[PDB]
């Protein structure tokens, strides 16, 4: 399949990303508290449900939440402010809480069942969110004596995610805080705006995009 792209809601950020976040790829977004990385996740979970003419992929979403940062009311607000039915939008986000790093890995393994079920339907899974990729690994694997095993498990988790992205034409979007991922770093800008910086992309130039966080989620 040709690579599909999901608009972030921000024209500036889309331009930096070559059009939006890509299917068949993992986009990994870093930021401290209030950076906007989870707001971007929420916005993408709405945008992907739009038709391609409006920046979506007519897709369903699967969402893995490690720290209780998913806000259904925020989905509803973004959806309604973009003209979608808020209840329909929520029905097409399959939510799972991950309680620890092992459970997080099992959820990605067992997400393939729903992906397969939806694959040839009107709403195939097009976005798989892991917010956040590392919170449980960081909590559970303390010290340099634990680093080797932490990295091995995380590498296998990322491999599982890459396989789903490539085999089923899904955009994987993960959050992180400071491995074949496209890495975007968010920071506070001036006047309450946020800045995204793209770093180390093999085939996209580094650059920055300024965006806002509004009732529509993220936009210029
Ligand atoms: C590990 C035990 C399971 N618990 N739930 C499962 N399958 C159902 C399910 C529902 C929504 C989901 N969003 C992301 C993954 C996902 C999965 S398998």
Swiss-Prot record:
Chain residues that bind ATP: 31-38
Any one GO BP annotation for this protein: DNA repair
Highest taxon in the source lineage: Archaea
Keyword terms, alphabetized: ATP-binding, DNA damage, DNA recombination, DNA-binding, Nucleotide-binding
GO molecular function, one term: ATP-dependent DNA damage sensor activity
Family classification: Belongs to the eukaryotic RecA-like protein family.
Function field: Involved in DNA repair and in homologous recombination. Binds and assemble on single-stranded DNA to form a nucleoprotein filament. Hydrolyzes ATP in a ssDNA-dependent manner and promotes DNA strand exchange between homologous DNA molecules.
Name of the protein described by the UniProt record: DNA repair and recombination protein RadA
Organism per entry: Pyrococcus furiosus (strain ATCC 43587 / DSM 3638 / JCM 8422 / Vc1)
Residues of the full protein shown: 108 to 349 of 349
